[PDB]
Design a protein around this ligand. Sequence first.
Ligand SMILES: CCCCCCCCCCCCCCCCCC(=O)OC[C@H](COP(=O)(O)OCCN)OC(=O)CCCCCCCCCCCCCCCCC
Ligand SMILES: NC(=O)C1=CN([C@@H]2O[C@H](COP(=O)(O)OP(=O)(O)OC[C@H]3O[C@@H](n4cnc5c(N)ncnc54)[C@H](OP(=O)(O)O)[C@@H]3O)[C@@H](O)[C@H]2O)C=CC1
Ligand code: SF4
Ligand code: SF4
Ligand code: SF4
Ligand SMILES: [Zn+2]
Lengths: 114, 207, 156, 94, 144, 342, 178
Amino acid sequence: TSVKPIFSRDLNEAKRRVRELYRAWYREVPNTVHLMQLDITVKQGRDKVREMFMKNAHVTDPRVVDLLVIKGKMELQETIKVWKQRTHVMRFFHETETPRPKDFLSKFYMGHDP
Amino acid sequence: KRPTVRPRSDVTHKQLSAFGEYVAEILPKYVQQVQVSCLDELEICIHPDGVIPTLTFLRDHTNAQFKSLADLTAVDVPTRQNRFEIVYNLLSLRFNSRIRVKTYADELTPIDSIVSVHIAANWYEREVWDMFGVFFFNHPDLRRILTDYGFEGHPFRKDFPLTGYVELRYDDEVKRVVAEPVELAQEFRKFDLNSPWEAFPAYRQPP
Amino acid sequence: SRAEYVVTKLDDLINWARRSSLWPMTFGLACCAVEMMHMAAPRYDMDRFGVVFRASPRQADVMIVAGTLTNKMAPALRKVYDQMPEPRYVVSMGSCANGGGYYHYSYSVVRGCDRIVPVDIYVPGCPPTAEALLYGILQLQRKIKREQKLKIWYRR
Amino acid sequence: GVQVSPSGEKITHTGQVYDEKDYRRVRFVDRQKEVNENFAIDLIAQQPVNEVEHRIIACDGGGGALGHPKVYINLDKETKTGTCGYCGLQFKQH
Amino acid sequence: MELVEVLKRGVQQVTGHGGLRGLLRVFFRANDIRIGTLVGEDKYGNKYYEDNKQFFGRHRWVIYTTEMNGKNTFWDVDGSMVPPEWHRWLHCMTDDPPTTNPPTARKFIWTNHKFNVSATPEQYVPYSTTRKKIHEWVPPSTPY
Amino acid sequence: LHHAVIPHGKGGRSSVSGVVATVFGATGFLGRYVVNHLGRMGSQVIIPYRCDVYDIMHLRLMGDLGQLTFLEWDARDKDSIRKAVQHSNVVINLIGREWETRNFDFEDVFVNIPRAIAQASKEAGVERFIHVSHLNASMKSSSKSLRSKAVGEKEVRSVFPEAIIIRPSDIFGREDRFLNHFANYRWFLAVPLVSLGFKTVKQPVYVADVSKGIVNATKDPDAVGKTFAFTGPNRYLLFHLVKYIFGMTHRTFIPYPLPLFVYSWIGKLFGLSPFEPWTTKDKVERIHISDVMPTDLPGLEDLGVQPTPLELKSIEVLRRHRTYRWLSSEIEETKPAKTVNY
Amino acid sequence: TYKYVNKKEQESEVDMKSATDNAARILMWTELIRGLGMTLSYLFREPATINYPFEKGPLSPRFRGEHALRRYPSGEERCIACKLCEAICPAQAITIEAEPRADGSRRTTRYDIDMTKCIYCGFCQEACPVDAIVEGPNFEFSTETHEELLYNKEKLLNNGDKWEAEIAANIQADYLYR
Ligand SMILES: CCCCCCCCCCCCCCCCCC(=O)OC[C@H](COP(=O)(O)OCCN)OC(=O)CCCCCCCCCCCCCCCCC
Ligand SMILES: NC(=O)C1=CN([C@@H]2O[C@H](COP(=O)(O)OP(=O)(O)OC[C@H]3O[C@@H](n4cnc5c(N)ncnc54)[C@H](OP(=O)(O)O)[C@@H]3O)[C@@H](O)[C@H]2O)C=CC1
Ligand code: SF4
Ligand code: SF4
Ligand code: SF4
Ligand SMILES: [Zn+2]
């Protein structure tokens, strides 16, 4: 309570910027799979976009949302340009990491971790 | 007179205390806690709203022509709720002197930028954003510099591990420099070196 | 006399060629490249051995990783190694590239170029004396001298 | 003391040798394991006692600043003898 | 004149290594002819010549052997074959060769030096010098 | 269960699994993926080789320090195999040529070398043995490769029971000899196909699925005496498969029919090649015999792998053949292939 | 004090002679014949290069290269596992694991050095109180395998028993400075 803002009087005016950013990403994906010759389909790129958006849907602080929008604009800059290579983009997909088992008994069969 | 210890003067101390009173009484809306150290390094501490006015003052004032930015650091102290102590080292070239302006911040209490005063602050503000996570208003670019492009994390934060959360290596299955999680063949050996004895009574914290 | 002997001598010839002329790359990242320059310099002259630099990786037979390899510079290293046309060799130069070095435990360092490029020969030091890099280059020459490729092809 | 095991491997002064079923014997195929033949236990045992006259003497290595820190050893016991911590030389008094 | 004198010096260079066999054995093998003084011969074959009229990288040099430990170094030569008694004098840590100021004798010092072993057998392989720490429980060999 | 075999770690590099393995065809197209999948999670991989040390460098990586040991061997020289399998739990056979040589015939590759390794492994006392035959492998076949693989699949079971025999279909990968083989028929101005490619069915599998299946077979308590059909989904028809290749590779498609005898004679004269040839009689035969329906064998899904469809991975391998004007073109511009069930 | 490097004192004095000299500097490349003559002079000098394997670079006793674990003249192992060579090693290259030897002596069961982490700084040998680990002269120990450059107690003792004849002399020369 009683804190300063950044770019957002409220959460709805932040969701506005969120949707602008989702839009820019949706319109950028077909150009990134083309310019640097990715070996994916546009469908799953945009699904990755929505996944990495819904990775942070629990948040309600406007300030956190604005900072996430800022970092999304940074990544979008890096991706619109080719400052980052196929390696960095396909880093999102985790095309080599085996799935962390989300089950008790598997974790018990391998490892002491919870 | 003692050889092993460092020589000591007083005129620099007095000059800098006088200039500290100067700034303190000329700029009271922002200034807190002027201080001068044993080694004579003047050190003014500032409310974050006062950044542009104070820096413009010290650049453009006649008796303070601090028109060269040497460093622009940040210091993470997790204890205090406003973690990041931000530092502005300056020099004059007219009086052959330095000064240090300080402010404070947090993860969600950013600060106005200084390219409107010192263009040298561009890449330093970018470095500070990258390393500690301090956003700077009305900055032209404000992207990373030093970290890799696909990099999550602000490394010089004290709560960040030295070794990181991702590691790189090439894979023939995909013919890319993939990023696997971190798994070291030799854990970094933390050493507990601090002695349990008060070495310096002058800095003794009372309870 | 024998086809196998003729093959052995032919392979000796091709190894002599690739060994007496191995063209490294102008690819140096950190302090170790200064000692590479010093090897190029008069005292330990490399061109004496037929080892002259070429800037393009396609006009190159070897790459010397003379410096620290970071997470931001590893894709470029691998692109360059790839673009080099086979036969091609790698020399890891310095502790920062053999292993992670003095920056082993840091967040932006790969803990050896072993993970990104296949290394033929490791040169230790921080920095390695250009005397030592030269020793390692002649050791790579000796490695090429015993390749026995056409021999095994005949024996397939 | 470079006696071997039945698995053929040399044993070190830190008695270390891999078991027969330990798969880590692979790395010594077309290769060997570096072991130092000159064991310091048997060597410093191959060293006589330096008799002295006093109950308290000192020991450095023998070079002075090239050996080890100066330490003093008591020689009041007669059943056993003195011993240095750094080196392993022995002393006795008559 | 002096041209004739340098030609004489070159004639001496050509004719101070035995003959054609001995000259080519040094010229195809070290790419130099410069004659110097034999400081001393090693216990493997190395020769360790010297000529102080040159400058401070060439006043001392080596002429290696053709067989060190059954390896045929007539062509494949390496700097790891200089033992430590002569390493010190060759890299110019001394003006005092081991033929005059020899080193101390010790029972544990290696007699026969070893060149660099990197790809051969009898190279180095790392291993844990330690032992089993957590011992297991060996169950009995009877039931119940 | 030695303490050094216990699996420690979070299943990654610089960890331990207990999969001390020999991989004999490690210097090839499938062995590299097997070694990568074994080193990715932490496991020592002995790699016997005869090739030059230059052709084992891509394998020199893909393993933490010590977990990759190389040592040379000769199939003609027994006592070089016990040297390798003396220290292992697992032994994986991926040896196989696509052509005979003056030194090694097909029997001497697919029968005698597996049998030798299996004798050595049963003497050494290893716990598992993964053999890799073919799906179409049958003693009643047209190709010498397939019949030899049948003989070896039988004799390995005889001498080393408690074995594992994986039977993949035509595998495709970046440096395969299947999709690149079809794609390299453009230098010649047309592709021949017996019966125009119809009456021939192909069920090709990706490499990584085969590798993951092998790598789990060396860990599953089941799969101890069992065969496997590593087929992949989407049975394709050969004409339409080549058409999809030549659409992904945007060149052209001028097919035409050709009897098996003249196409075989072409394979023979192309097999007169001291180097690695291009086409051969047995390759032609193996190309023009349909894949068996795997409906009576377990497969990948019974071992922990979802088969990746060819329409998902084809561009990775076939972009090498695209020209400029078609290189920067996506997967969704190729009208995917018609399938069958049969 | 300061001084100008490219500031003309004053201009505007020219006659036909100076004009001729400048016009002959131009049109004859006279200030380029000097560069040609310089490079020609260098063609006729003794080159600074050396036939490396046969004649080598000059080093000093202080030179710090390959490591070694030394012994006393009695052959006794000289390290005592005081475990500060790894305290100060700013790369965390050294490990020690120590026990009593069954003679009743503080000695090591382990002395490893990842020479791919070592920075060859000398702190270990100027921290050892007994002159046990040193940094010797060998700079010619390049390898074809990463695993070879990970040393242990036996390799370091082999180095010491190899290079004692050099290291003893280097130490004898350099002490009274350290
Ligand atoms: C009878 C009456 C009638 C008689 C008529 C004849 C009258 C006399 C004529 C003399 C004219 C000589 C030719 C001069 C041509 C060059 C003109 C010139 O001014 O120099 C050109 C260029 C300029 O240099 P700069 O200092 O920048 O001055 C230009 C300012 N505007 O400077 C340069 O070009 C330098 C850049 C090129 C450097 C290349 C390296 C040159 C190395 C020198 C090698 C010389 C070997 C020549 C041997 C030739 C054998 C075939
Ligand atoms: N398209 C495919 O890849 C398919 C493969 N398979 C099966 O997969 C396995 C391997 O496939 P692939 O990897 O393509 O085969 P490759 O030809 O790609 O590699 C085969 C390996 O066998 C080794 N090898 C061959 N002959 C000998 C020999 N005489 N002595 C010693 N080593 C030898 C080679 O080592 P070097 O190179 O050093 O000689 C090479 O690494 C075979 O069993 C094959 O039947 C089944 C169906 C399809
Ligand atoms: S190893 Fe040493 S000299 Fe070489 S790049 Fe790293 S810090 Fe610099
Ligand atoms: S400082 Fe010296 S005595 Fe102490 S552990 Fe290290 S090597 Fe041994
Ligand atoms: S020289 Fe320095 S970096 Fe190397 S082992 Fe000794 S203390 Fe560590
Ligand atoms: Zn003592």
